[PDB]
C-alpha cells in the first residue's frame, strides 16, 4: 500500500485470498471479497492536522 | 458505542464511550436488533414501510 | 412442504385452535377450549387441519451457516413423532438422516406470514448467493439413477442394426409409445441404441434448422436416434427446451438446472427438479448397485510391484547398513519408493476395475466418493503420518479387505485420532472468523440505483493465447462474471462491442473474446461514489436471483456468511 | 472352557491362549480392599513380597 | 367381513382419446395390487387388428429406398404402422394400395375389403414425386398384445415380404399412480389414478369394463375352488 | 411459438398457488410486495373485524373468498388479479 | 462395566477441556496394552477418557501394566511377566502372531517387533526376548466384541464402539450368530447375571426365588430382580434357566440379567438384511423395516418412570394428601382410592390425576368478580391452593407399585417433611418412526418407513426381508466389515459342509476340524484380530447346504435374486442379502419431540426457561438473526426479539389478540434492554436515552 | 389370438400346504397375478385370534405369579402363538386353570362349542410344588393385524389385560412362472404358486377367499361405469 498505491494492494488482497480459496475446489465471487476488503481501506492517518 | 461494545472488548469501549461522551444515532442492523426496533435493510426501510395500498376505481365501483 | 407430527403441531397452534373451535360451537367458552384441546377430544383434529392450511412454518437447524439454513415450509399432519424433510434440501441444510434434529418457529402476524411466503419460501432459494451454482439439484441416489437410465450401452438387447441385402432395418419404433410396449415384452433395453419417432420434443437447436424452416410446434414428426432412457428424461423437462441427447453427468445436470433457471421462470424450475427427483429415486433402486465382498476386486499385478518395491527398498537399506547414506536420505528414498508404489497400484486398480461394477458407478457419475477411497479400499493403504505430523518409512502394505495386522491398524488409529481432533479446532476457527467478519461488514447496505461513476476494476479475460487464439482464462467465471462495465469495450479499428452499462454474462465474454477484446473496465464496490452504501449497479448482478440486485438489501451479512461458510472443509496444508 | 455351563460356540481362531482374561473389575475391588486392609488383601501383599503391608 | 366405504370410480377426459380414471377410497394395500394388475390387462388382454408384414413393387433385394416417392422405405413403414384397423376374420387377409401419377397418398386410398375397415382415412402414408407410381399389399391379421416382427416362416418362398411389428392392443399408453387419503382421521388408505391412451377404434371406457371383466374371470376361474368361504363383502 | 409461450407449467398446489413471478411483475420488488400483500391482509381482517355498526371505512375482499381462505391468501389473489394500487413512499 | 473400566484426564489436579492443545489427545505408541486407542468419546472430550486394555494391571504406585511371554535363545517359555513402560521401552517385543514351532522356535528368520521409539522393524529371532500374549492386548471390552476390527476404519470403530454402549433391553434377548467371544466374560463380570456360589442340584426354581442344595449340606436362596427401574429409566429383570432338579457347578449360570442369553451378552437381534436402494425412503442413512418387527413384538422394550411428589411443613399451613380437589368433575376421580391415590394396575392418559394434594393458600385478596361468581354457584372459597400431581406432557403407561413415606412411620425423612408418595409408571415401546438403529460397526440411522409385509422385497422361496440398507453409504465410509459379517451370519443361520471328499479343499487348509460341518442357526465366533479371513468365507458362502426344497438362494458371490413385493417383476440384477445383528439405540422420538406454545418465564430477565422437562422454548441464536438479516425480514426478526421473548405487554397483548381473531400489536421495548439499562446505571455511567428535541425520555412508564 | 380359457389344478404338497398350477397366461402377465394373489392372501384374510386375558391373582403386565416359572410377561408372549379357530361373531370367552406341579400346555385349555385349538403340544408356563394358574381368554375374529385396544377407551376393569392380536392364518406364499404353455407360440407363461397356512384354514379356502375379494375389486372396477 505505501509503495504502489491503493489499488494494488487491493489486487494483493483479492489474488490472496482467492488462491488460498481455489485450492480446496470452492468457488467464491470476487465480489463477496471486494465488500471486506473496501471496509478495510476506509480510514487515514492525520499527519499534518 | 453499542456495536463495539457488543463486539468485543466491552470494558475497554465503555470506558472510552463514558470519557468521549458519544452519541449513539442508532443507525444500524446491530444496534436497532438490540432495541428491538427494525433494521434498516430488506423492508425495514422508509421507502418499503410507507406503502399505501388502496383499491382501484374500477374494482372500487364494481364491487 | 414438510410432515410435522400431529401432537406437536396441536402445541404450536394451540391459541388459533381454541379460537376456532370456539366459533364452531364445539366449546361454550375460552376456558372449555382449553380443557377439549388439553383432553385430546376426538374433534380438534379436524380444526386443526383446518387452522394449518396455507400457514407456512420456519425450519432451522444449528449451525445456521448461510441464508439457505432457515427456509419456510407448508405444514402437513403425519401419524409419527418426526419431521419429515425434503430430500432436495439436504445439501442446503447440510443436514444427514441419522439422529439429526431441527426446529421450528411459527410466523404470527401478517408480515411474518408474508414475508415466510414470499422472501423465505424453499421454491425461491434455488441458487447459492455464494456462487449461483444449484443446491436444490439431485444427487446421490437419484445422480445415480440417472445416469444409468441415460448411458448407452453397445450391444444391447434390440438395438438399432444397418439395413442389409435381404432384411430391412431392424430396431425403428414408431412413436416412444411402441418402444415402452417392447421393452415391457423383454426384446428392448432402455440403454440400446434406437431410432424413435418423435411427435413431442424439441429437435436439438440444429435440426431444427435443417427440417423445419420455420420453427417447430406440437404435432410436428422427426426420427431421433437415441435411447429410451434420454426419451424419457427429456419428456422430464419442459417442452420448450430442446432435445439435450446426452449422458447425464453430475455436471450435465447442473448445467442443465442453471440453463433452466437462467432461461425459465422459477416455478418451471421447481417443478422440473422435483420431476428430475422422482424419477432418479424409481430408477435409482433397479440400477443393480450392491457393495459385496466379490465386487471389491484387486489387480493381479499388485504383488509383483510389491515384491519389486520391497526388493528395492531392501537394496535401499542395506546400503545404509553399509555406512554410504544418511537416514535422511533414507527416509525420503523410502517415502518416494512408498509413494510410487501407492500410485501403481492406484493406476493398476483403476484399470482392472470394470465400467460396470457398482462402485466405479458410484465414483465416476459423481454421486460420492473418490479414486483415493477406492485404492484405500482394495490395494494398497499408503503412506501413514505419525502423531507429531511425520510420514512413517513403513507404509500399510494390507488393504482393509485383506486384513490389517495389529500394528499398522495401531498407526491408522493414530492418523485418525490426529484428524478427528483437528477437524474440531479448524471448524471453531472458522466460525470465530465467520463471527469477525459479519460484524465488520454490517454498514454496507445497498441505497441508491446508480452512482453515475466512471471508475471501475480492470479484469482480463485473456492473457496471451498460444497463437493468437486468445484462450479463456480458467478463472473468468468468478472474475467477469454478474458485473457491470464501466466504458464501451473498444478494439483495433474502434467499434463498440458491448455497451457501458450492459450486464456481462457467457455471450458477452464469448463476444469479446472473438472480437479481439483482452481486457475490460468492470464496476465493483472498491471504487464508488455512494454517500451511504454501496449503489445497485456497482454491486451488479445478485448471484441468487439471478437479476439486478434489490435496492435495501443487506450485502455485507450476506458475503461474510459466504466467505466463512467453506471454514470447515478448508484442509491446511 | 473354563466356565462350566456355555453354550457351545465353534471358533475360528487359530492360536492357543496362554493367558486367561483377569478379572475384570479388580481395578477398582484390589484398590479399595487394600484401602481398607481386608485380610485377603495382607495375604496377597505377603506373597507378592513386600516389607510392611500398610 | 365388511369393508369400511364402497369405492368410487369417475372419469375425467383429457383429449379426444385419453382419460384419467380415479378409484377411491381403497384399503390400505390394495392400490397397488390394482393398479398393475390392470395395467397388463389393459395393455395385453384386449384384442384388436393390425398390419403384419406388407410387399412393396419395385422394391425386391436393395430395402433402401423407393424410387419416384420422397420418402424412403423406414418412413413408409413408420406411417403404415399407425394405421389402425378393424378385422372381423381371424384368418389373414389382403389389402392393396394403388396411387397413380404426383399427389400425396392417405390411409383413404386402400381398398377395403368385405370385413375390413378403416378408421383414419385422413392419415398421411407417402407423398409422390412427378410421374411415379405406388403399389403396396398389406396383410392384415387379428390377436392381441404386442408381438415383435416375426421372421419369414418360408425359406425363399416369398422374398419381397417385408415383417414388421405388430400392435394388435387398441390401448397404446397406460400410467398408474397411487396416492393416499384421509376418511376419518386415518390417513392411510390409498387412492389410484389411472391414465390411459387409447387409439380412435374404441372409448378409454370400453378399454377398462373389457380389462375389469376379463379380471373378474380369472379370479373368478381362482374362486370356484370353495365359493362358500369368507371373504370381504363390498356391498350393493 | 414456443418462445412466446415460454409460461407453460402445470397448476400450482397450495401456497404456491399464485405465481411468484407474476407477482413480482405486478409489483416493483420482493420487499415491496411484502408489503404490499400485509397491509392488504391487514386491511381485509380489519374489515372482518369491524363493528359494522359504525362507519365503513375500508373495502372488503374485492374478490370472492373460499370457505375458510386466509386474508393474505385473498390479498395475494387480489394483487394477481390487478385490482388494487400502491405508491412507494 | 465400561464405566467401571474408565481411565478420567479431567477433575481436581488434572487438565481441563479448554486448557488442552493437541499435544495430550494423541495415542501414544506407549498405549499398546495399557489403554485402548479406539474407545474414546467422541465430543469435546476426545483423548481425555479412555478404557483399560482386558489384559491390563495397575502397579502398587499407580503404575499400568500389561504381561508379556518371556522368550530366551528364539524359543518362547510359559512363563509371564508384567511389564511397565519403562520396563518395556529397555527391552524387544515381539508380535503375538509371529509364527511358532510345536516347542516354541520361530519358523520365520524375520519377526515383527517393538523398539524403544515404536521403530517397528524386523529382527533375527535370537534379538527377541519378549512376545504378546493374545493379538488382542490392544483393545477394551467393548472394542473387542466387534467383528472383523480390522476391516473396519479407525474412526467407524470409535463410533461403533461408543454406540454398542447405548442399546436398550430388550422384552426378549437372543445372542448374536456371529461374536468375538469376548461375551460370556463380559457378562459373568459385568455383574447383572446370577453365578452359584457352590456346586449341587436345584430344588425349587421360581420367577422371583432359586433355592440351590450343596453337596456340603447347605441351602443357598438368590432373590432375583423383576421389573426394577434403573438409573436411565430402562427396566432390568432376572429369569431363571434352570430347572428343578438339575445339578449346578459352582461359577455357572443360573438366572440371565436384562440384556443375556444363557450368559452371553445380547444387544440386539439379528434381522435379514438387503443392501439397495428402495424408493428413496432410505435415502441418506435412513433405514426401511419391516412390519413384522412390529407384529412380533422383536424390537419391543419396557420403560418405567417414577413420579413423586412430596407434602412438606409450610409456614403459613400445613400441606394434606387427598381426595379434596374442590374445582374438579366427577369423573376425574374415579381411579383414586379412599387415600387420593391412583390404584395398581390402572392406566393412566395424559393429564390425568395421580396423587392429590391439597396446600393451603393463606389470605388473598380475589376479584370481586371471582367473589360474585363464589356467591352465586356456593362454592366456599377455602385458603387451598390445588396442587394435585398430573401425568407430564406426553406420557402414559400403567401404574405398577406406589412407595408412601411418613414421618410418624419412623422414617429417616429430611426435617420439614411429612409425607412423599412415589408413583412408577411402566410403559411398553414398539418399534416406530423416528427411532434410531445401529450396528456394531458405526453405521446408524433413524427409521423412515416401516413398510408391510406384502411390500418389502422377498425371497425366491417367499421370505420377506426385514431391513433394507442404502448401498452408497457403504464405500464412502470404508466399513466393509458390516459386509462381511452379513456374508458370514447367512452362513452361520444355513448350516454348511465342505466337500472333503476327493482330498481337502486348498481354501480350508488351516480350518480347524470342527468347523468342517455344521447344523442349520449354529453359531460362530470371529475374535478381533484372529478369525475368519476372505478366503474361508468365499469358501464357506460356496458350500452352504440348501433349505426345505432344496435349492440355494444365494450364490458364491453372496447375492440373490430378490422380488419386488408392490409390482411382482423380479429385480433386474442380483442384491446382497444375509443376517445383521443390530442394536436399537436409546434416541427415541418419545423423548425427544418438544413443543411450546406457553410456557414458563425466568426472573433476572422476562425469557422463557429452556429444556423439555421445564416446559421451555428454543433458542434464537445469533446465526439465526444473522440468516434474518441477510435474507431481510425485518418484521419477522422485530416479532421474534420483542414479543414472542420480552415484550412484557406485547405477549398479553399478542395472545389476546390471536384468540378473538384480532390484528397483533406493535411491539414494545424488550426488558432485557431495560435490564442492561439499569446495569449500566449501577456502573456510575450516565446513560440516557434522547428523544427528538434533547429531553431524557423516562423508562418508568407504568 | 388363442381361445384356450386358462385353467386352475391343485397338487398337494403336504398337510397344511398346496401348488396351484395356472395356465395358459399371455407372456408378461403371470408374475402379476402371482404378485396380486399373494399380497391378497397376506393381507385380507380373516381368522380368529385371542385378544385379552384374565389371570386370576394379577393386575397388570408387569408382574409375577408365585409358583411359576415365567412372569405374566412371557406367558402373554407365549399365548400369542395359539392357532384358533372360531365361527361365531361375538367374543367368546374360553378357560384355562391347572394347580400342581406340572408344565401347563395348549391342551389343557377347555373352549366353548365352536371354538377349538389347532396345537395342543405348545408350552405355556410350568409350574412347581407351590403355583396355581387360572386364566380366561376371549377369542374374536378380524383380519389383519389389530393392536391392543386400551382399557380407558375399552371401558373395562382393572384385571383385564389387553394383548395384540393377529387373525392372518398365512405363513408363506411365493410363486413361479414357466413360460413353457405352447399352443401355436412358445410365449404363453405359466403361473405356479405356493400356499401355506397355519393349519387354522386349508389353503383350498384361503385361495378361494382371496379369489372372491379381487372378484368383487375388480368387478367394482367395472360395474361403476
Ligand atoms: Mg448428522
Ligand atoms: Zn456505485
Given at each position: 500500500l505505501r509503495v504502489q498505491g491503493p489499488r494494488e494492494v487491493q489486487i494483493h488482497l483479492v489474488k490472496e485470498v482467492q488462491e488460498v480459496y481455489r485450492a480446496q475446489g470452492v468457488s467464491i465471487h470476487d465480489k463477496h471479497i471486494e465488500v471486506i476488503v473496501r471496509q478495510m481501506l476506509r480510514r487515514v492517518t492525520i499527519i499534518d492536522s | 458505542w453499542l456495536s463495539a461494545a457488543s463486539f468485543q472488548e466491552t470494558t475497554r469501549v465503555l470506558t472510552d464511550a463514558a470519557i468521549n461522551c458519544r452519541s449513539d444515532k442508532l443507525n444500524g442492523l446491530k444496534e436497532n436488533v438490540i432495541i428491538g426496533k427494525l433494521i434498516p435493510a430488506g423492508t425495514g426501510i422508509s421507502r418499503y414501510r410507507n406503502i399505501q395500498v388502496q383499491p382501484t376505481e374500477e374494482a372500487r365501483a364494481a364491487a | 412442504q414438510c410432515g410435522l407430527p400431529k401432537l406437536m403441531a396441536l402445541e404450536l397452534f394451540k391459541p388459533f385452535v381454541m379460537k376456532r373451535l370456539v366459533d364452531l360451537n364445539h366449546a361454550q367458552n375460552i376456558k372449555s377450549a382449553k380443557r377439549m384441546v388439553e383432553r385430546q377430544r376426538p374433534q380438534v383434529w379436524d380444526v386443526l387441519e383446518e387452522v394449518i392450511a396455507e400457514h407456512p412454518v420456519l425450519l432451522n437447524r444449528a449451525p445456521t451457516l448461510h441464508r439457505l439454513g432457515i427456509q419456510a415450509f407448508e405444514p402437513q399432519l403425519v401419524e409419527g413423532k418426526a419431521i419429515q424433510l425434503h430430500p432436495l434440501v439436504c445439501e442446503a441444510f447440510n443436514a444427514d438422516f441419522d439422529g439429526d434434529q431441527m426446529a421450528v418457529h411459527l410466523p404470527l402476524s401478517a408480515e411474518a406470514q408474508a414475508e415466510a411466503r414470499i422472501l423465505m419460501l424453499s421454491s425461491n432459494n434455488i441458487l447459492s448467493p455464494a456462487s449461483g451454482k444449484p443446491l436444490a439439484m439431485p444427487r446421490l441416489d437419484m445422480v445415480t439413477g440417472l445416469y444409468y437410465l441415460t448411458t448407452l450401452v453397445e450391444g444391447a438387447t434390440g438395438e438399432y442394426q444397418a439395413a442389409t441385402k435381404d432384411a430391412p432395418e431392424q430396431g425403428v419404433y414408431s412413436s416412444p409409445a411402441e418402444a415402452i410396449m417392447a421393452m415391457d415384452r423383454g426384446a428392448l433395453s432402455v440403454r440400446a441404441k434406437i431410432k424413435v419417432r418423435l411427435t413431442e420434443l424439441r429437435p436439438p437447436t440444429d435440426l431444427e434448422a435443417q427440417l423445419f424452416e420455420n420453427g417447430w410446434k406440437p404435432g410436428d414428426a422427426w426420427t431421433a436416434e437415441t435411447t429410451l432412457g434420454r426419451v424419457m428424461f427429456n419428456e422430464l423437462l419442459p417442452k420448450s427446451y430442446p432435445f439435450v441427447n446426452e449422458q447425464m453427468h453430475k455436471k450435465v445436470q447442473a448445467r442443465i438446472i442453471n440453463d433452466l433457471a437462467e432461461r425459465f421462470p422459477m416455478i418451471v424450475v421447481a417443478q422440473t427438479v422435483d420431476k428430475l427427483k422422482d424419477a432418479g429415486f424409481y430408477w435409482a433402486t433397479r440400477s443393480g448397485v450392491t457393495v459385496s465382498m466379490a465386487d471389491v476386486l484387486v489387480p493381479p499385478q499388485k504383488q509383483e510391484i510389491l515384491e519389486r518395491h520391497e526388493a528395492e527398498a531392501d537394496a535401499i537399506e542395506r546400503k545404509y547398513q553399509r555406512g554410504a547414506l544418511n537416514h535422511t536420505e533414507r527416509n525420503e528414498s523410502l517415502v518416494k519408493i512408498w509413494q510410487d508404489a501407492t500410485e501403481e497400484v492406484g493406476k493398476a486398480l483403476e484399470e482392472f476395475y470394470p465400467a460396470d461394477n457398482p462402485i466405479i458407478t458410484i465414483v465416476k457419475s459423481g454421486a460420492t466418493g473418490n479414486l483415493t477411497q477406492t485404492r484405500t479400499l482394495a490395494g494398497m493403504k499408503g503412506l501413514v503420518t505419525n502423531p507429531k505430523g511425520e510420514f512413517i518409512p513403513r507404509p500399510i502394505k494390507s488393504s482393509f479387505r485383506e486384513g490389517l495386522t495389529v500394528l499398522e491398524y495401531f498407526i491408522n488409529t493414530h492418523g485418525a485420532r490426529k484428524g478427528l481432533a483437528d477437524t474440531a479446532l479448524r471448524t471453531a476457527d472458522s466460525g470465530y472468523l465467520t463471527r469477525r467478519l459479519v460484524d465488520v461488514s454490517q454498514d454496507v447496505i445497498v441505497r441508491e440505483h446508480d452512482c453515475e461513476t466512471e471508475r471501475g476494476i480492470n479484469v482480463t479475460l485473456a492473457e496471451r493465447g498460444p497463437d493468437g487464439t486468445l484462450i479463456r482464462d480458467a478463472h473468468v467465471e468468478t472474475s467477469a462474471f454478474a458485473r457491470t462495465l464501466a466504458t464501451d469495450a473498444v478494439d483495433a479499428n474502434g467499434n463498440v462491442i458491448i455497451e457501458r452499462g450492459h450486464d456481462l454474462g457467457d455471450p458477452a465474454i464469448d463476444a469479446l473474446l472473438a472480437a479481439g477484446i483482452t481486457t475490460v473496465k468492470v464496476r465493483s464496490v472498491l471504487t464508488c461514489t455512494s454517500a451511504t452504501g454501496v449503489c445497485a449497479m456497482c454491486y451488479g448482478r445478485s448471484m441468487a436471483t439471478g437479476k439486478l440486485v434489490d435496492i435495501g438489501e443487506a450485502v455485507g451479512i450476506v458475503a461474510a456468511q459466504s466467505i466463512g461458510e467453506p471454514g470447515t472443509q478448508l484442509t491446511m496444508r | 472352557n473354563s466356565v462350566p455351563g456355555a453354550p457351545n460356540r465353534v471358533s475360528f481362531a487359530k492360536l492357543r491362549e496362554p493367558l486367561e482374561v483377569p478379572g475384570l473389575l479388580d481395578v477398582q475391588t484390589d484398590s479399595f480392599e487394600w484401602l481398607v486392609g481386608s485380610d485377603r488383601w495382607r495375604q496377597a501383599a505377603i506373597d507378592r513380597g513386600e516389607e510392611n503391608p500398610v | 367381513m365388511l369393508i369400511s366405504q364402497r369405492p368410487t370410480l369417475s372419469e375425467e377426459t383429457v383429449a379426444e382419446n385419453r382419460s384419467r380414471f380415479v378409484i377411491e377410497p381403497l384399503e390400505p394395500g390394495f392400490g397397488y395390487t390394482l393398479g398393475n394388475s390392470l395395467r397388463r390387462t389393459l395393455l395385453s388382454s384386449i384384442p384388436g387388428a393390425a398390419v403384419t408384414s406388407i410387399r412393396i413393387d419395385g422394391v425386391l433385394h436393395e430395402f433402401t429406398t423407393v424410387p419416384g416417392v420422397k420418402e424412403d422405405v423406414t418412413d413408409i413403414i413408420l406411417n403404415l404402422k399407425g394405421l389402425v384397423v378393424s378385422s372381423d376374420d381371424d384368418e389373414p387377409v389382403t389389402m392393396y394400395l394403388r396411387k397413380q401419377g404426383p399427389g400425396v397418398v392417405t390411409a383413404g386410398d386402400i381398398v377395403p375389403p368385405a370385413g375390413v375397415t378403416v378408421h383414419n382415412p385422413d392419415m398421411h402414408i407417402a407423398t409422390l414425386n412427378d410421374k411415379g407410381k405406388l403399389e403396396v399389399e398389406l396383410v392384415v391379421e387379428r390377436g392381441r398384445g404386442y408381438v415383435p416382427a416375426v421372421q419369414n416362416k418360408a425359406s425363399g418362398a416369398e422374398i419381397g415380404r417385408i415383417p414388421v411389428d405388430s400392435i394388435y392392443s387398441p390401448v397404446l399408453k397406460v400410467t398408474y399412480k397411487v396416492e393416499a387419503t384421509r376418511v376419518e382421521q386415518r390417513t392411510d388408505f390409498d387412492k389410484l389414478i389411472i391414465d390411459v391412451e387409447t387409439k380412435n377404434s374404441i372409448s378409454p371406457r370400453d378399454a377398462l369394463a373389457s380389462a375389469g371383466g376379463t379380471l373378474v374371470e380369472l379370479f373368478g376361474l381362482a374362486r370356484e375352488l370353495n365359493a362358500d368361504s369368507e371373504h370381504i363383502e363390498i356391498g350393493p | 411459438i414456443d418462445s412466446s409461450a415460454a409460461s407453460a407449467y402445470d397448476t400450482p398446489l397450495g401456497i404456491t398457488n399464485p405465481p411468484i413471478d407474476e407477482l413480482l411483475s405486478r409489483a416493483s420488488s420482493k420487499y415491496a410486495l411484502v408489503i404490499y400483500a400485509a397491509k392488504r391482509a391487514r386491511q381485509i381482517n380489519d374489515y372482518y373485524n369491524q363493528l359494522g355498526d359504525g362507519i365503513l371505512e375500508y373495502v372488503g375482499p374485492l374478490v370472492e373468498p373460499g370457505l375458510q381462505e386466509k386474508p393474505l391468501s385473498i390479498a395475494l389473489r387480489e394483487i394477481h388479479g390487478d385490482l388494487l394500487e400502491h405508491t412507494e413512499g | 462395566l465400561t464405566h467401571k473400566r474408565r481411565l478420567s484426564a479431567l477433575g481436581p489436579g488434572g487438565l481441563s477441556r479448554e486448557r488442552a492443545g493437541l499435544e495430550v489427545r494423541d495415542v501414544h505408541p506407549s498405549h499398546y496394552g495399557r489403554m485402548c486407542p479406539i474407545e474414546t468419546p467422541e465430543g469435546p472430550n476426545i483423548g481425555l477418557i479412555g478404557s483399560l486394555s482386558v489384559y491390563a494391571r495397575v502397579n502398587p504406585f499407580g503404575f499400568i501394566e500389561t504381561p508379556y511371554r518371556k522368550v530366551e535363545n528364539g524359543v518362547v517359555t510359559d512363563q509371564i511377566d508384567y511389564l511397565t513402560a519403562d520396563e518395556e521401552d529397555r527391552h524387544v517385543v515381539a508380535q503375538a502372531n509371529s509364527p511358532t514351532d510345536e516347542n516354541g522356535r520361530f519358523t520365520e528368520d524375520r519377526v515383527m517387533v517393538r523398539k524403544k521409539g515404536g521403530e517397528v522393524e524386523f529382527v533375527s529371532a535370537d534379538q527377541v526376548d519378549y512376545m504378546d500374549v493374545s493379538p488382542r492386548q490392544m483393545v477394551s471390552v467393548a472394542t473387542a466384541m466387534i467383528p472383523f476390527l480390522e476391516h473396519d476404519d479407525a474412526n467407524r470403530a470409535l463410533m461403533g464402539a461408543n454406540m454398542q454402549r447405548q442399546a436398550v433391553p430388550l422384552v426378549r434377548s437372543e445372542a448374536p450368530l456371529?461374536?468375538?467371544?469376548?461375551?460370556l466374560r463380559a457378562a459373568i463380570d459385568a455383574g447383572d447375571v446370577v453365578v452359584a456360589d457352590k456346586t449341587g442340584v436345584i430344588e425349587e426354581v421360581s420367577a422371583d426365588y432359586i433355592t440351590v442344595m450343596a453337596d456340603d449340606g447347605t441351602r443357598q436362596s438368590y432373590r432375583l430382580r423383576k421389573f426394577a427401574r434403573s438409573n436411565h429409566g430402562t427396566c432390568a429383570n432376572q429369569r431363571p434357566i434352570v430347572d428343578a432338579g438339575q445339578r449346578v457347578e459352582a461359577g455357572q449360570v443360573i438366572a440371565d440379567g436384562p440384556c443375556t442369553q444363557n450368559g452371553e451378552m445380547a444387544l440386539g437381534k439379528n434381522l435379514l438384511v438387503a443392501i439397495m436402494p428402495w424408493e428413496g425412503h432410505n435415502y441418506e442413512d435412513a433405514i426401511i423395516l419391516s412390519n413384522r418387527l412390529v407384529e412380533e413384538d422383536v424390537l419391543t422394550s419396557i420403560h418405567i418412570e417414577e413420579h413423586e411428589i412430596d407434602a412438606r411443613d409450610t409456614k403459613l399451613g400445613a400441606e394434606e394428601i387427598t381426595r379434596d380437589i374442590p374445582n374438579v368433575s366427577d369423573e376425574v376421580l374415579a381411579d383414586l382410592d379412599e387415600r387420593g391415590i391412583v390404584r395398581i394396575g390402572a392406566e393412566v392418559r395424559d393429564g390425568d390425576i395421580l396423587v392429590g394434594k391439597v396446600t393451603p393458600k393463606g389470605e388473598t385478596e380475589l376479584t370481586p368478580e371471582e367473589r360474585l361468581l363464589r356467591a352465586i354457584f356456593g362454592e366456599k372459597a377455602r385458603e387451598v391452593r390445588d396442587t394435585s400431581l398430573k401425568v407430564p406432557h406426553g406420557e402414559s403407561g400403567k401404574v405398577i407399585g406406589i412407595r408412601v413415606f411418613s414421618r410418624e412411620d419412623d422414617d429417616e425423612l429430611p426435617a420439614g417433611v411429612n409425607e412423599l408418595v412415589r408413583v412408577y409408571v411402566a410403559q411398553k415401546r414398539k418399534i416406530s418412526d423416528g427411532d434410531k438403529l445401529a450396528g456394531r460397526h458405526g453405521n446408524k440411522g433413524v427409521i423412515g418407513k416401516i413398510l408391510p409385509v406384502e411390500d418389502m422385497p422377498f425371497l425366491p422361496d417367499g421370505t420377506p426381508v426385514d431391513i433394507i440398507l442404502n448401498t452408497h453409504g457403504v464405500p464412502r465410509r470404508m466399513n466393509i466389515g458390516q459386509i462381511l459379517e452379513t456374508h458370514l451370519g447367512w452362513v452361520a443361520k444355513a448350516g454348511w459342509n465342505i466337500d472333503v471328499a476327493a482330498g481337502v479343499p486348498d481354501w480350508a487348509s488351516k480350518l480347524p476340524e470342527e468347523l468342517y460341518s455344521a447344523p442349520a442357526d449354529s453359531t460362530v465366533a470371529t475374535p478381533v484380530f484372529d478369525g475368519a479371513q476372505e478366503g474361508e468365507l468365499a469358501g464357506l458362502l460356496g458350500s452352504t447346504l440348501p433349505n426345505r426344497d432344496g435349492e440355494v438362494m444365494v450364490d458364491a458371490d453372496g447375492k440373490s435374486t430378490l422380488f419386488d413385493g408392490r409390482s411382482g417383476e423380479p429385480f433386474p440384477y442380483p442384491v446382497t442379502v444375509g443376517y445383521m445383528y443390530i442394536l436399537k439405540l436409546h434416541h427415541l422420538v418419545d423423548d425427544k419431540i418438544h413443543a411450546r406454545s406457553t410456557g414458563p418465564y425466568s426472573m433476572i430477565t422476562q425469557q422463557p426457561l429452556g429444556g423439555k422437562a421445564q416446559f421451555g422454548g428454543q433458542r434464537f441464536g445469533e446465526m439465526e438473526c444473522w440468516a434474518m438479516q441477510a435474507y431481510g425480514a425485518a418484521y419477522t426478526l422485530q416479532e421474534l426479539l420483542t414479543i414472542k421473548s420480552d415484550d412484557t405487554v406485547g405477549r398479553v397483548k399478542v395472545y389476546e389478540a390471536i384468540v378473538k381473531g384480532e390484528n397483533i400489536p406493535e411491539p414494545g421495548i424488550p426488558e432485557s434492554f431495560k435490564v442492561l439499562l439499569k446495569e449500566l446505571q449501577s456502573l456510575c455511567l450516565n446513560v440516557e436515552v434522547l428523544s427528538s428535541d434533547g429531553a431524557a425520555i423516562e423508562m418508568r412508564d407504568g
Open positions: - | - | - | - | - | - | 456371529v461374536g468375538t467371544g469376548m461375551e
